[PDB]
Amino acid sequence: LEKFCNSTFWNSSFLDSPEADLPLCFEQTVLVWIPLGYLWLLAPWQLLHVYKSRTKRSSTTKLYLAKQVFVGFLLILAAIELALVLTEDSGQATVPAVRYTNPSLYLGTWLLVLLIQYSRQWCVQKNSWFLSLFWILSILCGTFQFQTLIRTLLQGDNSNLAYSCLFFISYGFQILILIFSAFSENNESSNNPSSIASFLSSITYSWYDSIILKGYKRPLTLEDVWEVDEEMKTKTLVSKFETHMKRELQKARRALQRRQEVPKSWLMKALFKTFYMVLLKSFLLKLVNDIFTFVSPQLLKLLISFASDRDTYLWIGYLCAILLFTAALIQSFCLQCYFQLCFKLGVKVRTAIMASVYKKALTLSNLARKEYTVGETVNLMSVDAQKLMDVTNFMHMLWSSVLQIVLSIFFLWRELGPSVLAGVGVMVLVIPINAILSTKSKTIQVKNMKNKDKRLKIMNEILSGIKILKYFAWEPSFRDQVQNLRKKELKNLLAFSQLQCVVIFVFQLTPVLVSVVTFSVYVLVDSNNILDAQKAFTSITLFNILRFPLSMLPMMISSMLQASVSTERLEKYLGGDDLDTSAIRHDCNFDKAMQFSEASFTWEHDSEATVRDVNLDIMAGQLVAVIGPVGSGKSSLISAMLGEMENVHGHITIKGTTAYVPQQSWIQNGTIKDNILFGTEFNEKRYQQVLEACALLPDLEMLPGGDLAEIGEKGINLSGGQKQRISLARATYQNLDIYLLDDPLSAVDAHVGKHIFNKVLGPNGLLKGKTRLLVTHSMHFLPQVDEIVVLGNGTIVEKGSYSALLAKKGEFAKNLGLISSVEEIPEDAASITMRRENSFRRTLSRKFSIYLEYLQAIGLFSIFFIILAFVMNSVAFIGSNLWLSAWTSDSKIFNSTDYPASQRDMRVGVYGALGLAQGIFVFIAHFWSAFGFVHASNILHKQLLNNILRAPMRFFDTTPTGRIVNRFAGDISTVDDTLPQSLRSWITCFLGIISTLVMICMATPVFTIIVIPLGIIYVSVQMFYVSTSRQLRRLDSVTRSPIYSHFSETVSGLPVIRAFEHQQRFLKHNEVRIDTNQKCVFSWITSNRWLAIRLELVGNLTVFFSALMMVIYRDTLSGDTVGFVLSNALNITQTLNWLVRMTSEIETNIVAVERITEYTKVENEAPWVTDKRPPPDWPSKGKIQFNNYQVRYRPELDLVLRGITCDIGSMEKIGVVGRTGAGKSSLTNCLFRILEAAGGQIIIDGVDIASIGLHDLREKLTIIPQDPILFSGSLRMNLDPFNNYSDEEIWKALELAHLKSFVASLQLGLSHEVTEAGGNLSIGQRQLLCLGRALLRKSKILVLDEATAAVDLETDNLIQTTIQNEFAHCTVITIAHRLHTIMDSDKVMVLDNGKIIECGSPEELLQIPGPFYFMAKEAGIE
């Protein structure tokens, strides 16, 4: 190279000076060879890759011509430079070839740049990574030439000016070209801008931000979320996975058959063989990032060394700061891309498993299907697949730990020595302790869950039946009855809370402990050891680096253990056998549409044949009926026709299609029209005919929505009579060839059955040509059939026509969130794991004022002290660092053989004391925090319960029960579980950040300036993220439940699905429903990565400046002062991301307190007890009177009852009777003050009901409930919750009620338990018991109602007479509809539309014609 060039390649004199620079020999050689090599070496492929995939050229845009003209300018500039150089010196001038090759080289390269750019015009991504990286390499290499050239000229030499000006122009044009090579230049494809995006946009995610702007202004819906790429569409992933699954299983089955004469491991392989490439790429990226994790500490040590002494050069510090900035930037850019790749792979695996499970479900054999449960398979897809997604989101950790740890350990020893082991051991002993406490926490949480479940069950009953409680005034008892359970749960909650505090304490103080032990052991083990700043601060940095893997490796091992059993379970279902179909021949026999050649089928595998030796044939257009006894096997025969049984001997010939009407009707979710259509083009000449013939017209008219009324699990639940007619209508509208009806006229009555038979299926009906096979139990329609068969014991006994069988004279005669892994937020490694586990376990079972309110519930007195403790801990932290910074500074004064013992002891005793103080203050803060919450949950729930239990009926009527009960279950769980964890983590993160900034600003009072700008950027970048992520969190939940709903529906109705041959439609529906959720998950997976690049950039900028500010003031700075500032600021990048993410969860979770508060402040009704007390034995006589009583249910609604003036005498029986909508039932709800008194008043015993207190009036009144309701518990609780009576008087009551026979001979006496609404008891005694309930009170005024409607005749009679025999010295008012029953009333009151009309004796009312007489004439009682 010496003869090629003219100057020396490298000499110490070039450097080793205040001013130092590489010569124009090293810079004009290697620095102009690296950039060219990258372009030349890796061009061919980047042309082969374009050559094979050449498509249509894209329209030309201004950017293209600009990029082409700038390169042309470069070309002409290089050409003119070469010409000038050649012309300058030709004769007697041995010009070095550095002036010949370099010019020519560039001229050669620019040509390739022009060509490669044109070729890109024929691909999707125009600006790829190749050129974008080339330009950066060129600029970085050419900055050095620019650095020296300028100096040479500035120094004062004028020898070379053309070259400098030429080089300067080129360097600029290069800058401009790089700037132009970043614009997206989009084709504006509505699918997604991810495919069309330059390198820089696709590496800083500056294309998602459009959505960030769209969601900030207005709420965003499913329309404006970009669709997923084709490579991820469900249809594509399945095929790819299916190929390898099919290829593997067969080999696994062969291996299992060859040996041991149910596969063992195939799923895991099928996944690796399908997705190895993404694994390889992610592994490479993770390996590259793993390197930067240990690069920083070396630059930090270099900074400490440079700042320690004084006789150095500034360039060293400036270069080190620039290198630190660049390393941080590169590490962040690589890490984000690795995260994106891994999470995308996880989503792909989850979709490819869920869709494949769904596709198998509808082709599995009957045996395996009957082995499983309907909910079990849904839980299988909803739980197993999700578990596999997690173990594929964090697998690379396994290898990225055993390596990281090793590397870290190596650095430590080279830095300190064997003392390091002391720290590691203390950092290893923590994990064992952590386990003993997790097991205890789980043990407590199990009983917590059990007691919580017991509490909610009583809540549901009282909320649903709030009417009966109000009538009998039983509210006070349930208060304490539920408060007992509340306290019993609260004690366990407090125990669990204080246990969780010990765990956070050990994970919180471990950094200081390891530091005190390591430093003390190192300095005290040998007198020769001297502590210096570089070693100490670098050791701290490596300890902080190593602290994570040793704490995530335990978690990863536990997760893989769960995924093992999850995989094992799925492989049984996805590898199950298929039903056999080599028994039904779909041939066009034509001679017959059915043939049985001595068939014999069995339900089980090899058990007894349910159908044995059956042989029959029926021609087309023949209606034949199959009859027999119970358990004969008809439905088994029709299922064998469908082919749902295992063949044993014989074959069945079927011509044409088939239609099925199952005995147990199956109804989907949706409108009635959708169910009737069942995937068919809508018509008008047939739809109307079907609905009318099936007599589904009158009922449809009565439905609230008519034809478009939502039916199914989440809608009107129809009865057997209707659901059967809907199924029959669907079957008859689909219009197939062969109909197999299984008892379709059982739920309907005689009229509807006759109409359907004469209009739909029969001699003259819709299906008059198609063959019909009907199974029946009624002999009413037998004469109108063609042939009948009598099945017996699974075989045919007699087959013949109606007349023939009757003539045969035999048997017939008698017969007729937002978190994906624990690597993204490593500090909160535990809480995240617990939340996942809790959610998985819970799946199986199934204006700043609110912050002030929650703090007031907690208690501000304790809040002040807790904040004081946390703040004091931060001060003790900064204090310890300054003591070390002083301790490390101490070394320069002394030497190896001058260190005294007193200094050695003093420099460590104080360090130990400060560590102890830090530990104590944290422990105290955590100790109080736990209690400060258990009290909050108690006051919030108790306060809420008393208020909600006292609300008037309006509120209970307007709001659905579901909303009210959810607050008592979900919110209370949220307010006492995750809430405290986040509320206690956020303050720790904020105080850590604040403490770090005080330290840097203290050392450099100048730093205070940068704080303001960063804050404005931080709080700005912050609002944006939350303003969008919150909305996407909701969309995801709304677009998930559908999938599991669909799977449950198809699994339940498989035979009907497979009888109609309608599987492709359902597969397509499932594929669409999966692609809707797969589109929404990615939209938040990308957003999290957007925030990171922005915040990691901010966090790296705030440390770059600090470093530079300590090089311009280094004259006044020591080596240690440049240690505590950088050693801490090095970990401020990720803490910002953690704070934003954690403050985006606390904000979403505070919604719980808000809801609870609204119901705690619901309007209340009149006070229960007032000072006005009634005279003793107030209801002495039954004297009621109404003075123009007028009332309205709600203020916005009009008066329902008006102008009421009647008199009620003592010991008088009154019958209230009227028309519909006359307010008869309102009269009762007016005597118990359930409503108010818009006009008039009610006076009883001379005392207006208003004056008497609420709970003081109801006690002395009795009413028989309209719908007898029985609460859970024991028989004593239903009869007397208040345990006021004794058993003796109770035992008399059942004797009067004719129920002592049942209760005396029961399993127990009065202590027998009852299930829900008395489910254990039968209907007969449920209505009877409520009679006895009211009997015990033996009040004076009894308000009866029409509640004997479902009471059986004999029982009814008993009830009627019982009333007369027992209630004689009392006043009885009865609202009834049995006009006949109303005959003995002393006065009969008549209501028309809310006005008293006739008041007289029934004999007088009938003697004189009138509205009552007209009603009796219509009724015909007399």
Ligand X SMILES: CC(C)CCC[C@@H](C)[C@H]1CC[C@H]2[C@@H]3CC=C4C[C@@H](O)CC[C@]4(C)[C@H]3CC[C@]12C
Tell me if 720 is assigned to a ligand binding site: no
Task: Give the tokens for residue 315.
Answer: 């360039």
Q: Which residue number, 65 or 179, has a Cβ lying nearer to ligand X?
A: 179
DSSP 1286: -
Question: 427: Cβ–Cβ under 8 A, 6 or more apart, which residues?
Answer: 510, 514, 546, 547, 550
Q: Which residue number, 146 or 180, has a Cβ lying nearer to ligand X?
A: 146
Whole-angstrom Cα distance, residue 820 to residue 1031?
18
Whole-angstrom Cα distance, residue 1051 to residue 1055?
9
Q: Give the residue carrying structure tokens 């010019």.
A: 103
Tell me if 419 is assigned to a ligand binding site: no
Q: Output the smallest distance, CB 982 to ligand X, in A.
A: 8
Residues in the chain: 1422
Residue 1160 burial (CB < 10 Å; 0-12/13-18/19+)? middle
Whole-angstrom Cα distance, residue 335 to residue 1089?
10
Tell me if 215 is assigned to a ligand binding site: no
Tell me if 1224 is assigned to a ligand binding site: yes
Whole-angstrom Cα distance, residue 945 to residue 972?
11
Q: Which residue number, 12 or 1064, has a Cβ lying nearer to ligand X?
A: 12
Q: Which residue number, 305 or 477, has a Cβ lying nearer to ligand X?
A: 305
Helix (H, G, I), strand (E, B) or coil at 919: helix
Among the listed residues 922, 919, 917, the one whose alpha carbon sits nearest the alpha carbon of residue 866 = 922
Tell me if 221 is assigned to a ligand binding site: no
Q: Which residue number, 318 or 678, has a Cβ lying nearer to ligand X?
A: 318
Question: 93: Cβ–Cβ under 8 A, 6 or more apart, which residues?
Answer: none
Q: Which residue number, 197 or 857, has a Cβ lying nearer to ligand X?
A: 857
Question: 54: Cβ–Cβ under 8 A, 6 or more apart, which residues?
Answer: 122
Question: 606: Cβ–Cβ under 8 A, 6 or more apart, which residues?
Answer: none
Q: Which residue number, 139 or 403, has a Cβ lying nearer to ligand X?
A: 139
Q: Output the smallest distance, CB 142 to ligand X, in A.
A: 9
Q: Which residue number, 816 or 868, has a Cβ lying nearer to ligand X?
A: 868
Q: Output the smallest distance, CB 1140 to ligand X, in A.
A: 10
Tell me if 1385 is assigned to a ligand binding site: no
Helix axes 720-734, 750-759, angle to 10 degrees: 0
Q: Taking the alpha carbons of 1007, 544, 1121, 292 in that order, is the dihedral positive or negative?
A: negative
Q: Output the smallest distance, CB 237 to ligand X, in A.
A: 40
Tell me if 1223 is assigned to a ligand binding site: yes
Q: Output the smallest distance, CB 303 to ligand X, in A.
A: 11
Whole-angstrom Cα distance, residue 3 to residue 96?
8
Among the listed residues 908, 932, 86, 1137, the one whose alpha carbon sits nearest the alpha carbon of residue 501 = 932
Q: Which residue number, 105 or 863, has a Cβ lying nearer to ligand X?
A: 863
Tell me if 452 is assigned to a ligand binding site: no
Helix (H, G, I), strand (E, B) or coil at 1388: strand
Task: Give the tokens for residue 240.
Answer: 């790819």
In single-letter form, the type of residue at position 94 comes to T
Whole-angstrom Cα distance, residue 511 to residue 919?
11
Tell me if 1210 is assigned to a ligand binding site: no
DSSP-assigned beta bridge partners for residue 792: 795
Q: Which residue number, 504 or 866, has a Cβ lying nearer to ligand X?
A: 866
Q: Which residue number, 329 or 1399, has a Cβ lying nearer to ligand X?
A: 329
Tell me if 643 is assigned to a ligand binding site: no
Q: Give the residue carrying structure tokens 């919180």.
A: 508
Contact 645, 808 (CB under 8 A): no
Q: Which residue number, 315 or 1291, has a Cβ lying nearer to ligand X?
A: 315
DSSP-assigned beta bridge partners for residue 1342: 1262, 1372
Q: Output the smallest distance, CB 559 to ligand X, in A.
A: 31
Q: Which residue number, 41 or 1023, has a Cβ lying nearer to ligand X?
A: 1023
Whole-angstrom Cα distance, residue 788 to residue 68?
90
Q: Output the smallest distance, CB 245 to ligand X, in A.
A: 48
Whole-angstrom Cα distance, residue 540 to residue 877?
14
Tell me if 635 is assigned to a ligand binding site: yes
Q: Output the smallest distance, CB 661 to ligand X, in A.
A: 60
Q: Output the smallest distance, CB 326 to ligand X, in A.
A: 6
Q: Output the smallest distance, CB 143 to ligand X, in A.
A: 5
DSSP-assigned beta bridge partners for residue 654: 594
Q: Output the smallest distance, CB 165 to ligand X, in A.
A: 16
Q: Output the smallest distance, CB 881 to ligand X, in A.
A: 24
Return residues touching ligand X (CB under 6 A): 12, 15-16, 19-20, 140, 143, 147, 150-151, 154, 314-316, 318-319, 322-323, 326, 848, 851, 863, 866, 929, 983-984, 986-987, 1143, 1146-1147
Neighbour order of strands in the sheet with 1396-1400: 1261-1263, 1341-1345, 1371-1375, 1213-1218, 1387-1391, 1396-1400
Task: Give the tokens for residue 595.
Answer: 């043939």
766: number of Cβ within 10 Å? 18
Q: Which residue number, 325 or 956, has a Cβ lying nearer to ligand X?
A: 325
Neighbour order of strands in the sheet with 611-614: 611-614, 599-602, 646-649
Q: Which residue number, 323 or 1021, has a Cβ lying nearer to ligand X?
A: 323
Residue 135 burial (CB < 10 Å; 0-12/13-18/19+)? buried
3-state SS, 959-973, equals CCHHHHHHHHHHHHH
Q: Output the smallest distance, CB 333 to ligand X, in A.
A: 15
Tell me if 632 is assigned to a ligand binding site: yes
Q: Collect contacts of 20-24 with beta carbons under 8 A, ≥24 apart.
A: 20/313, 20/315, 21/147, 21/148, 21/151, 22/144, 22/148, 24/145, 24/148, 24/149, 24/152
Which runs of consecutive H residues, i.e. helices, occur in 129-228? 129-155, 162-180, 199-204, 209-217
Q: Output the smallest distance, CB 477 to ligand X, in A.
A: 37
Q: Output the smallest distance, CB 16 to ligand X, in A.
A: 5
Tell me if 912 is assigned to a ligand binding site: no
Tell me if 630 is assigned to a ligand binding site: yes
Neighbour order of strands in the sheet with 1184-1190: 1207-1208, 1184-1190, 1239-1244, 1247-1248
Q: Can you say which residues are annotated as belonging to the binding site for ATP?
A: 628-635, 1218-1225
